Amino acid sequence: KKVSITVDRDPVATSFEKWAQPGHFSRTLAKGPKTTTWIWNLHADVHDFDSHTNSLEDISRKIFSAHFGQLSIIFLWLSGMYFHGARFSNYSAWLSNPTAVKPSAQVVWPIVGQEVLNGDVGGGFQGVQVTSGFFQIWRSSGITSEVELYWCALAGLIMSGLMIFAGWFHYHKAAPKLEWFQNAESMLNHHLSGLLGLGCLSWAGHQIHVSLPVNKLLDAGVAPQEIPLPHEFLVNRDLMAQLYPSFSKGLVPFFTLNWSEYSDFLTFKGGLNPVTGGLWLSDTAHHHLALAVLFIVAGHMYRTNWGIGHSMKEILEAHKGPFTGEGHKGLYEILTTSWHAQLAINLAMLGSVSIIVAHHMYAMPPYPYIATDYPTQLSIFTHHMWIGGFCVCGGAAHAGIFMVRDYNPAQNYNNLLDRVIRHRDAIISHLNWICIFLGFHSFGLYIHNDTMRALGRTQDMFSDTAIQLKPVFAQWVQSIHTLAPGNTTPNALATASYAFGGDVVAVGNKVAMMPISLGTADFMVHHIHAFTIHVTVLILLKGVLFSRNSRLIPDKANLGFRFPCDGPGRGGTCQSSAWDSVFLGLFWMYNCISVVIFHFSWKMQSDVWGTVQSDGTVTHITGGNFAQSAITINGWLRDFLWAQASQVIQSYGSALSAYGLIFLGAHFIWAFSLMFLFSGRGYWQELIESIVWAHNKLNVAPAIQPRALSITQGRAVGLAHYLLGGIGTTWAFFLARIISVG
């Protein structure tokens, strides 16, 4: 039983004394401010626990309790989302008419004329239209009343209180020892089996006993207050067997392995529900039940306390071949002694999963009536692309913090890390060449087209009409997925998504999903994507690989992860740190994700979204202009940015005037950021000197001597306002555009 619970009791005293002493956590900051730099250095380094403490135990304790604090905030956030749905929303009116009522769960106070924001969202209601997709979640959950939304809100508040108690309790009363945190086999067994496996299984149970009966009655057309309460399905097994006759047999088919009996509610239909335009919830129930089984199975792989299981160290040390030296030896020690190495992996994977979520949810719309709510489809795609891109760049941020700090060459001799660092010139030169090739052969095709169209030579352009760059591999994969039902997925009845080909699914005369054809414009913008992702990898990988040393600076690890430069010598070493590649790679992430959401927005409006009428033909939002106009930059400028900015500019005096104001406000913040990005600290300190002089003249100089921001903080402030401004402009542009027309 070497996997055991070990706790120090009453480690840290619950006292308000350190609250009154800002900066108590570091030796530099605890002696108080003398310049204004102290104030900024206080906020900058506060959650950098491994910069304050030497011991991995105290660092692990601070992290565990801070994760409870984060959970408490998320539960509070969720509880408020339910309460605004319960109290300030048109949810009940939306349940009766999901295709007519626009979801709204935010009402403004009348103060300075701002009550114009309470627009007519429908259902005898005035409020701010919400695009987070909660209404579609709640109907998928089977909520059907505001009373149940109040109970969910209380359930979030109780959980929110319990997490903040646990964070206090596990830091101040019962803090686990380092040997508790260093149980990677136990944690993985429980997080696969217990968290993910029982998470899916329990949710499958809710889906089967609550979501499936309630949503069958809704899609049959029964009024929400005419629907039995969710526990009457749990007790009256006769009533549940009316909707799904397999329930007449109970749990004998489950235990005797006669699973085919359960095909009423555990289907493999594929495609969409014609009534709601969403995934069949009988499929999602089977999906979560099947996922639950193999998460519970996966969580029995590793060895804890009984000899059965794998040692993760043994798996890693055995995988070594003739190209890779000692192989994965020493990686277990890295990943059970470095939190940053763990955070680097988990941020890159969570960011990747968030990017996948964006693609899977628009193409295979999971919730009822979310596919034809186009403001939600655009909002949750754009939101989850940004979460993914940010989290991916923090994976390289913390891979750099690992390499600078937690990397020890003595324990990493001739293994995979040692070998990567020892040919990093070959990696970075090959990536650099790919990015030049990719930029020339993706963006240069656009420049070729701008010139040819401007020169009157439309026969010389790369277009469907002219020279054709077809995406044959993507078209071929689309062919296979339409052929899969009955052929390579024989028991499936419909395709995984109608985006691959097949029918047009219409709900309330609006397209839910329909085949997303790929042409020359799709070939061009996909290689635009591969170029922007590869350059982002190039900037971030070069920062991780050269974080400790270069040919330029032989001792970059002694300067740290985050330093501004090593002087104007060697020609100039401005922005040479690993932090400065995260800084430069967040711009190229911003560039990458901006083109992705622009590609998504224009393609869905031009080729997918719109209205169906007689003869079954579809009138799209921008009328199919993507194919012949997304091949030039002038087409993107004119037919996408200029044409679709009309709604946000003409929004003044409407309920969308808030988006019009945020459009201008974010344009401001973006431009203001360039003051911090294009300027240097030395100018601003000398300007402050004259301002200090005028204060000295009036005897009003401060005792905390004002300083210009650090070189790094000028970069961090410039990047933050650039991101706030750039993303905030697109947020207003996307939301005012798609609320008006979709």
Partner 1 sequence: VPQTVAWSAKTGAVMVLSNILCIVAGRYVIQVKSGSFAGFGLPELLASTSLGHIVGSGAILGLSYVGVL
Partner 2 sequence: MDSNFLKYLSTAPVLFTVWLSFTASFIIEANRFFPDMLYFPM
Ligand X SMILES: CC1=C(C/C=C(\C)CCC[C@H](C)CCC[C@H](C)CCCC(C)C)C(=O)c2ccccc2C1=O
- Residues annotated within a binding site for chlorophyll a: 24, 43, 47, 62, 67, 77, 84, 106, 109, 114, 131-132, 170-172, 180, 186, 189-191, 203, 206-207, 209, 237, 259, 286-288, 300, 304, 309-310, 319, 328, 346, 360, 367, 383-384, 398, 419, 423, 430, 433, 441, 448, 457, 473-474, 478, 481, 488-489, 491, 526-527, 534, 562, 579, 590, 667, 675, 683, 695, 713, 721-722, 730-731
Binding partner 1 by CB under 8 A: which of 6, 15, 260, 690?
260
Q: Residue 479 or 491: which CB sits closer to partner 1?
A: 491
Rounded to the nearest whole angstrom, what is the least distance from the CB of residue 186 to partner 1 in the complex? 15
Residue 17 contacts which entry, ligand CLA, partner 2, ligand X, none (Cβ below 5-8 A, type-dependent): partner 2
Q: At what angle do helices 711-741 and 579-607 cross, to 10 degrees?
A: 10
Site string for ligand X, 708-727 (x = CB under 6 A): xx----x-------------
Question: What DSSP string runs through 134-153?
Answer: HHHHHHHHT--SHHHHHHHH
Q: Residue 341 or 584: which CB sits closer to ligand CLA?
A: 584
CA-based R_g, the chain, Å:
29
Whose CA is closest to 449, among 631, 685, 594, 615? 631
Q: At what angle do helices 374-401 and 520-545 cross, to 10 degrees?
A: 30
Cβ partners under 8 Å of residue 458, min gap 6: 452, 465, 466
Binding partner 1 by CB under 8 A: which of 173, 206, 300, 448?
300
Q: Residue 111 or 257: which CB sits closer to partner 1?
A: 257
Whose CA is closest to 196, among 286, 284, 282, 298? 298
Q: At what angle do helices 657-678 and 711-741 cross, to 10 degrees?
A: 160
The secondary structure element, H or E, covering residue 375 is helix 374-401
Rounded to the nearest whole angstrom, what is the least distance from the CB of residue 25 to ligand X in the complex? 20
Bridge-based pairing of strands 610-612 and 505-507 is unpaired
Q: Residue 560 or 706: which CB sits closer to ligand X?
A: 706
| Binding residue count for ligand X, defined by CB under 6 A | 9
DSSP state of 423: T
Q: Residue 253 or 439: which CB sits closer to partner 1?
A: 253
Cβ partners under 8 Å of residue 360, min gap 6: none
Stretch that binds partner 1, among 197-205, 210-218, 257-265, 725-733 (CB under 8 A): 257-265
Binding partner 1 by CB under 8 A: which of 124, 307, 568, 569?
307
CB of 524 closer than 8 Å to CB of 517:
no
Hey, which residues between 473 and 492 contact partner 1 (CB under 8 A)?
491
Cβ partners under 8 Å of residue 394, min gap 6: 343, 347, 351, 582
**Position 583 contacts ligand X (CB under 6 A):** no
Please give the Cα distance from 681 to 671 (Å, whole number): 18
Stretch that binds partner 1, among 60-68, 127-135, 216-224, 252-260 (CB under 8 A): 252-260
Q: Residue 39 or 107: which CB sits closer to ligand CLA?
A: 107
Rounded to the nearest whole angstrom, what is the least distance from the CB of residue 259 to partner 1 in the complex? 5
Q: What are phi and psi of 504, to 5 degrees?
A: -100, 120
**Position 674 contacts ligand X (CB under 6 A):** no
**Position 221 contacts partner 1 (CB under 8 A):** no
The residue of the chain with the least Cβ separation from ligand X equals 714
**Position 263 contacts partner 1 (CB under 8 A):** yes
Whose CA is closest to 644, among 598, 592, 596, 591? 598
- Side by side, the strands of the sheet bearing 505-507 are 505-507, 510-513, 610-612, 618-620
Hey, which residues between 611 and 640 contact ligand X (CB under 6 A)?
none
Q: Residue 17 or 238: which CB sits closer to partner 2?
A: 17
Residue 150 contacts which entry, ligand CLA, partner 2, ligand X, none (Cβ below 5-8 A, type-dependent): none
Question: What DSSP string runs through 251-297?
Answer: THHHHTT-GGGGGGTS----SB-TTTSSB-HHHHHHHHHHHHHHHHH
Q: Residue 330 or 714: which CB sits closer to ligand X?
A: 714
Stretch that binds partner 1, among 179-187, 303-311, 587-595, 671-679 (CB under 8 A): 303-311
Stretch that binds ligand X, among 74-82, 491-499, 620-628, 679-687 (CB under 6 A): 679-687
Stretch that binds partner 1, among 50-58, 307-315, 457-465, 574-582 (CB under 8 A): 307-315
Q: Residue 277 or 395: which CB sits closer to ligand CLA?
A: 395
Binding partner 1 by CB under 8 A: which of 259, 413, 433, 642?
259
Q: Tell me the β-bridge partners of 620.
A: 610
Please give the Cα distance from 350 to 2 (Å, whole number): 31
The letter for the amino acid at 376 is T
CB atoms within 10 A of CB 637: 12
Angle among Cα 565, 583, 533 to the nearest 5 degrees reads: 130
**Position 323 contacts partner 1 (CB under 8 A):** no
Residue 19 contacts which entry, ligand X, partner 2, partner 1, none (Cβ below 5-8 A, type-dependent): partner 2
Cβ partners under 8 Å of residue 551, min gap 6: none
3-state secondary structure of 736: helix
Rounded to the nearest whole angstrom, what is the least distance from the CB of residue 119 to ligand CLA in the complex? 15
Residue 592 contacts which entry, partner 2, ligand CLA, partner 1, none (Cβ below 5-8 A, type-dependent): none
Q: Residue 245 or 682: which CB sits closer to ligand X?
A: 682
Please give the Cα distance from 716 to 292 (Å, whole number): 43
Rounded to the nearest whole angstrom, what is the least distance from the CB of residue 612 to partner 1 in the complex? 32
Q: Residue 195 or 704: which CB sits closer to ligand X?
A: 704
Output the six-digit token pair for 103: 């979801």
Residue 307 contacts which entry, partner 1, partner 2, ligand CLA, none (Cβ below 5-8 A, type-dependent): partner 1
Angle among Cα 284, 286, 290 to the nearest 5 degrees reads: 115
Residue 700 contacts which entry, partner 2, partner 1, ligand CLA, none (Cβ below 5-8 A, type-dependent): none
Residue 684 contacts which entry, partner 2, partner 1, ligand X, none (Cβ below 5-8 A, type-dependent): ligand X
Rounded to the nearest whole angstrom, what is the least distance from the CB of residue 175 to ligand CLA in the complex? 12
* Footprint of partner 2 (CB under 8 A): 15-17, 19-20, 22, 111-112
Beta-carbon-side half-sphere exposure of residue 165 (alpha carbons within 13 Å): 6
Q: Residue 300 or 359: which CB sits closer to partner 1?
A: 300
Output the six-digit token pair for 630: 């997304």
Output the six-digit token pair for 364: 């295979």
Q: Catalog residues that contact partner 1 under the rule CB under 8 A.
A: 256-261, 263, 297, 300, 303, 306-309, 491
